[PDB]
From a paper:
The type I transmembrane receptor Sortilin-related CNS-expressed receptor 2 (SorCS2), together with SorCS1 and 3, Sortilin and SorLA constitute the Vacuolar Protein Sorting 10 protein (VPS10p) family that is central to many pathways in control of neuronal viability and function, and has been associated with cancer and neurodegenerative diseases such as Alzheimer’s1 and Huntington’s2. Two roles have been identified for VPS10p members; in particular, SorCS2 and Sortilin are well studied for their function as extracellular receptors for the cognate proneurotrophin ligands to regulate synaptic plasticity and trigger apoptotic signaling, and they are responsible for binding and sorting a diverse set of ligands for secretion, internalization and endosome to lysosome sorting. Each chain consists of six domains; a large N-terminal ten-bladed β-propeller followed by two 10CC domains (10CC-a and 10CC-b), two polycystic kidney disease (PKD) domains (PKD1 and PKD2) with an FN-III topology, and an unpredicted C-terminal membrane proximal domain (residues 958-1066) that we termed SorCS membrane proximal (SoMP). The cross-braced homodimer architecture and the domain composition of the VPS10p subunit followed by two PKD domains and a SoMP domain is predicted to be conserved among the three SorCS members.
The crystal structure of NGF bound to sSorCS2 was determined at 3.9 Å resolution and shows a symmetric complex, defined by a crystallographic two-fold axis, with a 2:4 (sSorCS2:NGF) stoichiometry. An NGF homodimer is bound onto the top face of each β-propeller of the sSorCS2 homodimer. Both NGF dimer chains interact exclusively with the sSorCS2 β-propeller in a mixed hydrophobic-hydrophilic interface of 1920 Å2 buried surface area that is conserved both among SorCS2 and NGF orthologues and paralogues suggesting that this binding mode is common to SorCS members and proneurotrophins. NGF β-strands A and B of one monomer and C and D of the other monomer form the palm of the hand that has predominantly hydrophobic interactions with loops on the top face of β-propeller blades 8, 9 and 10 that are part of the tire. The hand fingers, formed by β-strands A′ and A′′ and the loop connecting strands C and D (L4), are positioned above the central β-propeller tunnel and interact with loops on the top face of blades 1, 6, and 8. Finally, the hand thumb, consisting of the N-terminus of NGF, interacts with loops in blades 9 and 10. Binding affinities of 236 ± 78 nM for NGF (n = 3), 43 ± 12 nM for proNGF (n = 3), and 69 ± 1 nM for proBDNF (n = 2), are disrupted by introducing an N-linked glycan in the NGF binding site on sSorCS2 (F630N). In short, in the sSorCS2–NGF complex two NGF dimers each interact with sSorCS2 at one side while the equivalent symmetric receptor binding site in each NGF dimer remains free and exposed.
Residue numbers in the entry:
A (entry chain A): 131 to 212, 216 to 329, 334 to 862
B (entry chain A): 863 to 897, 900 to 1022, 1032 to 1066
C (entry chain B): 129 to 238
D (entry chain C): 128 to 238
The structure:
Amino acid sequence: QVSLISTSFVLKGDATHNQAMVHWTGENSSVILILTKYYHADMGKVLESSLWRSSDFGTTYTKLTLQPGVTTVIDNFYICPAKIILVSSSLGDREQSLFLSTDEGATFQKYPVPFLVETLLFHPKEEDKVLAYTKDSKLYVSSDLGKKWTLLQERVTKDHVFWAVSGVDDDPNLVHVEAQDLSGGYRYYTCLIYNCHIAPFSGPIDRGSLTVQDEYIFLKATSTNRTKYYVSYRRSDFVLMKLPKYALPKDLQIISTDEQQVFVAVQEWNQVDTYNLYQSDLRGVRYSLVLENVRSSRQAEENVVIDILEVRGVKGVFLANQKVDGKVTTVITYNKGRDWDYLRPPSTDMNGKPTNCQPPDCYLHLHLRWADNPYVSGTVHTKDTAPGLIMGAGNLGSQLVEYKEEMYITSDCGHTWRQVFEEEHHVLYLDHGGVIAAIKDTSIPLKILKFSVDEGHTWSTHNFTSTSVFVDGLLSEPGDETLVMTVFGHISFRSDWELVKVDFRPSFPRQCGEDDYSSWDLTDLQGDHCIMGQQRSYRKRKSTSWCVKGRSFTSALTSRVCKCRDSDFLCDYGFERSSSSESTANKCSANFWFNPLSPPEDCVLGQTYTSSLGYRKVVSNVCEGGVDLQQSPVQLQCPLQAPRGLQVSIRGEAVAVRPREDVLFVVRQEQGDVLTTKYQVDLGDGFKAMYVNLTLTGEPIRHHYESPGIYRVSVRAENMAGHDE
Amino acid sequence: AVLFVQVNSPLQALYLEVVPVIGVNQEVNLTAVLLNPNLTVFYWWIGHSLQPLLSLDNSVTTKFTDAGDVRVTVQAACGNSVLQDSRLVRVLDQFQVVPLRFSRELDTFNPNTPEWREDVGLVVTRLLSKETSIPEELLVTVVKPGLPTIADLYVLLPLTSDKRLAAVQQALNSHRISFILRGGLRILVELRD
Amino acid sequence: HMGEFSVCDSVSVWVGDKTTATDIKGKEVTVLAEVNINNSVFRQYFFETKCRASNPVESGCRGIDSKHWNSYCTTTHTFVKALTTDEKQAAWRFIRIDTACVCVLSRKAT
Amino acid sequence: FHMGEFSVCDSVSVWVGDKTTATDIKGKEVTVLAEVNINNSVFRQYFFETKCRASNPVESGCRGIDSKHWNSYCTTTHTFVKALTTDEKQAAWRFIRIDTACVCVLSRKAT
Ligand SMILES: *[C@@H]1O[C@H](CO)[C@@H](O[C@@H]2O[C@H](CO)[C@@H](O[C@@H]3O[C@H](CO)[C@@H](O)[C@H](O)[C@@H]3O)[C@H](O)[C@H]2NC(C)=O)[C@H](O)[C@H]1NC(C)=O
Ligand SMILES: *[C@@H]1O[C@H](CO)[C@@H](O)[C@H](O)[C@H]1NC(C)=O
Ligand SMILES: *[C@@H]1O[C@H](CO)[C@@H](O)[C@H](O)[C@H]1NC(C)=O
Ligand SMILES: *[C@@H]1O[C@H](CO)[C@@H](O)[C@H](O)[C@H]1NC(C)=O
């Protein structure tokens, strides 16, 4: 029927327990490294370890030795990204060292460290460049693979240091840092590989610097009664992000700054349960509503999780779990968030008795990122590696529960779902969705293994081991175009570890030809082919063919275009939709707090702003424009600004003032700067003085009071538009 | 030996809550919203006189014998930090007061942020002016801080004021004055008996 | 075939759909489906593990010196504290839960 | 006492009120609370632990083994109990590993 090989191996060391790390080295190398480490609780944090290396698909592991008492390798041993180099870290009471390899861990050379260590981080492309986070919160760097070291920063924050993108920004030697300045200041620095200071905007943050490797940079400005959040696109000047003025945020998290725009989640009302999903434009400023409610938890102390999954196989496909009242429902969108809908039930299994759910009153639901129930040991997952393939565990009805989890799969990107397994199952993909392997996720050991080569329509069972094993993890050879699988866990009767190599290549040793595929046109839940303005059709491997989809995969070969429609436009910032689903079309009306007549921020006299009508084309929608609700109003104007938000303050924290002292005064506005603005000033002691463009200076003015006592300072901002005090 | 100590180091923000308009000889229930227990230091600058009033409580109650514009300032220094907020209010004499009912649904989306309340009152005033053709700056809407959303409208003069009152009454009752709060959510405003 | 055999064949399963059980005193009690503690709702999950069969082979347990011994497999027994009710009062009672399958012997008379 | 002479392996039971440390299902060592508060009622975490006395009750591992064809040894098995424990951060009703019985393991010999 099929043809494969399976080989088990036990780490020969009898003294094996506690934890372990398994990692491949580069693509198509057949070399695996493992660190078997022994932890200690009760504030000990001590480690004892051994090192293992396999140079043959993980079928034979050699215990790598060193001459003295075996080195206490600590936690992260890590490889060089992209270019094979290995680094191992070692802890002592106060002492430290390092080990470096250039031949896949065959010859580890020893080097010393002139500082402590907590973690490391390589450069995405530079092979010999790597920085080091030092336990006492420091940041060192090295361009010679860590043989020697120099110092960059001294008060960095935990896991808020980044490298500049190598593909973007055209400069690859930058180091972005979130570091504590002075006493209780947090700033954003940018240094280079040699030395340093603050090129972009910098203010106060409470540990919230976030830079996704795409074009965006973000900032969390904590303030006095209302907080702010800033964005920087293509390393431009920082701009306050446009959130609803009165739909107030408590906390927020960047869901996806992937592809063209920004997806953020913002918890408005403190239900401690739900978030709202907002979407921006290409610049990442104009945020509009997309999804109403989503689950939200907090496993780690300061880390939260939000139930949403973006299918990378098709740009613009999202799945999300909403929590309304007490019901957790699953919804999907192909319109990149414009319209969402439920998942279609299969109504078939081994016994497809149609007493199961029909469309009208109960659909299909999936546990995306949350496993409520205890017996499952591994983290829950719904995977989306291949285009059109989405496999995951869930319920089948009106909401999700903890009791019953069934493994469903879809091969046409949500349109057709099918039920496969009872209970949850670890899933591993091979050959860009060519082979799907499943292992029951539970606390009981097992010896079975499910696998399917036809996208979950026919599975086969295999005894991959002899003694029953606790399943800890599934890994694949890097690239995922291969067909080599690695299973690892500790067996039942004894505690020693066990790994299993699985090789499906004996059944797939041939390359797929262009005639080894069948057609599959992309539709949605409505049978419409114009998705994102583009009719797409993909290829699916023939059932009567045993071939490899290849190092490079051919997808979306049949591409046709459509003209734009009302379904290709959503509301702009501050506009909302009327009525309900399958009723009134996309009518975006302006809500009350803001009106599109208002001028934009910083319209200097001379410029001409363009008012908006409340609609915008779906970002990444490639429909034929020209006609079909382009809605270019051609409304050009700009008015003179009026003085508002006038506030006078004293520089710093001079809570008490002494007579004959350099007292510094600063005045600020909020509604632009008109180039003819009068600022009258009385300093309470008869000092009359009128100035112009005080906010243009930004620097204080000195004054010295003669008599001890109380005074009232009055400032008047005046134009030909209004007056403020 | 005795030593009294107090422990309230950080102060975040303050805000002075006061209605924008009230008549002469009326008691004003000024509130000083601050970050705090009964340990609170409050300096109150009610008017022109320098000498500030001392208070441990958030609220004070005062009057105004004169009309016009009054500067009301409040300063808070519980620990070693100084916060201060000011507000200018109008004291009138020629006006008519109208109570205003809002729809109940608005309550479920009503934060007491004074700027939200300001924008709501401004929207109500705009709609009143658009449905009565009367001057817009002579209509002041204050929607209160209470949990149930209740508004009060001040209608100024600078007779014909009876017909203006009747015009607003017809604008609210005979035609229901509508308000688009949230997408798919419409609020209505009418009279509060 | 090979590897490491268990002397008796066991069957493990998690049970969240628990309705009835037997308490420590021997009275049939009713296990509540869900528990409320600190406004958190838990499902009563119990890990049960019984025997697959009392005769894995012809001579009772597997791998016994049958020439001089008689053998048979039997289920184990432990107690778990769970929120139950006895048709009258709801309380946190201890209930009987299976955990393993063990072989027991008896000397054979040649 | 229809069991027989003895079990194939030497078992020993005990009730543990002195529960301080344990290992959860995820493999992390946690600290066990001494007492539990539910509503206003205070309980104590008692655990019923049954383990082995020895891995070789006789010379050929387990008691009553056809050692001419098998190798044997006794080992302690377990189950998971939902108990109120805590880590360095938060306390929760975690499932921890508790010994509950003693079993025998066999392996085929080479004739
Ligand atoms: C700072 O700004 C915040 C909003 O960001 C203001 O917080 C809100 O203040 C109102 C008025 O005090 C709170 O409503 C109150 O609720 C209590 C019940 O807890 C009720 O008894 C009162 O009658 C009043 O309605 C509201 O909960 C609070 N929070 C939010 C999210 O709106 C605050 O007033 C501002 N203050 C300062 C000093 O900056
Ligand atoms: C392999 O597993 C199958 C299904 O569980 C079972 O029928 C068969 O006996 C097993 N074989 C071995 C050698 O374990
Ligand atoms: C001020 O408000 C408080 C709170 O309702 C009330 O007890 C008091 O009577 C009010 N005083 C005046 C003069 O309105
Ligand atoms: C604070 O002290 C004042 C004394 O004037 C008293 O009236 C008030 O009830 C006290 N409030 C609290 C919360 O103790």
